[PDB]
Amino acid sequence: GRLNQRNINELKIFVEKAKYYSIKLDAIYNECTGAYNDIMTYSDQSKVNQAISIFKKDNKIVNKFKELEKIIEEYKPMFLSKLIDDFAIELDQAVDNARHVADSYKKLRKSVVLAYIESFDVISSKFVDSKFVEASKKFVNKAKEFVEENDLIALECIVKTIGDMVNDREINSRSRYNNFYKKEADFLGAAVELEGAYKAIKQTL
Numbered sequence: 001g002r003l004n005q006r007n008i009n010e011l012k013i014f015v016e017k018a019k020y021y022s023i024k025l026d027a028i029y030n031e032c033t034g035a036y037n038d039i040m041t042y043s044d045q046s047k048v049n050q051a052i053s054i055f056k057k058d059n060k061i062v063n064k065f066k067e068l069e070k071i072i073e074e075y076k077p078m079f080l081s082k083l084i085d086d087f088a089i090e091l092d093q094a095v096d097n098a099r100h101v102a103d104s105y106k107k108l109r110k111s112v113v114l115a116y117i118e119s120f121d122v123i124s125s126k127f128v129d130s131k132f133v134e135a136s137k138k139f140v141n142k143a144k145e146f147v148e149e150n151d152l153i154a155l156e157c158i159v160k161t162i163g164d165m166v167n168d169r170e171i172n173s174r175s176r177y178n179n180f181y182k183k184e185a186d187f188l189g190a191a192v193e194l195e196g197a198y199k200a201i202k203q204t205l
Helices: 002-017 021-041 045-071 080-096 099-124 130-149 151-166 184-202
Strands: none
Touching: 002 099, 002 151, 002 184, 021 045, 021 099, 021 151, 045 080, 045 099, 080 099, 099 130, 099 151, 130 151, 130 184, 151 184
């Protein structure tokens, strides 16, 4: 009982603390999208420099990734802090001396999404209830497959379903994208099995 209540509370605490993880990552994508496209496209020396300047400006973008890193500080994967600094360093050399900056940005974003899943994986691995542990492995697998198809959409669905589960709201298994993403529906079905296993833990407390 002590262990299960601790398990539940740990998860609930993480989820609530990270409830803006998807909104905030979307905010980064929206601000950098015009700059990303111009680097990828005009790699025109002027436009490439102005795109670079928008990424670097006031170290704001890097600081937004550092903020996401901090939200999951207790669980974050060991590589994350490094990818962030590696991106900062590359951006700084491009300012001083550009497709590699944009590619590094994209890699980082996906790794930020995988870091939320990694955090959830760590926490769920502590659970003493074996059916929850199993449903969690299946969830994680389906989540990574959805991320390979689209990292920001995957993260948004992951954050929403897990949030719903921990606030006692029924998961919706109907596609919110008209079934355009091939991996959405299997992910939602795994979240429904996870919810059922989590329900069972909850209503024995």
